Amino acid sequence: MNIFEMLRIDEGLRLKIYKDTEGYYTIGIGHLLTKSPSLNAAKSELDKAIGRNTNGVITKDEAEKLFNQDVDAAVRGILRNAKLKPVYDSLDAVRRAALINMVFQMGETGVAGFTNSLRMLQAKRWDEAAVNLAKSRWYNQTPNRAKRVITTFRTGTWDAYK
Ligand SMILES: [Cl-]
Ligand SMILES: [Cl-]
Secondary structure, eight states: HHHHHHHHHHHEEEEHHHTTTTOEEEEETTTESSSOOOHHHHHHHHHHTTOOOOTBOOOHHHHHHHHHHHHHHHHHHHHHHHTTHHHHHHHHHHHHHHHHHHHHHHHHHHHHTTTHHHHHTTTTTTHHHHHHHEEEEHHHSSSSHHHHHHHHHHSSGGGGOO
């Protein structure tokens, strides 16, 4: 198991524009297109991202390409974030994947706000962090995915994905 496989499981794969759990237009493997309520706006962001007139549909290769870019960007965003970096640097490989997952889903700023959880993770107080992570809108809105990521931080194994 790895970050790619992990996110592919959490996000799924869709080749036509769709609405995410928050109602935002998305495509591929969780690639958010726009928050605007307009489908045309989403189509235009899609064409711009792909480099062609897609008409709201992309191929598998194209989805994978967006996915590679998104993963790379999340990593680099963590590495650039003063609040995230030190956490990421302190963790083992499996738990780093859990942090990347959360940034991919919620954005760097979003994650940077779990101040308290971040502090516990850095301190390696696993059970405590798991408990604090659960007291969040994130956990209440997407509980199954959240539970998977949380178990990963708690245990440091990929069991929730097996
Ligand atoms: Cl893009
Ligand atoms: Cl869920």
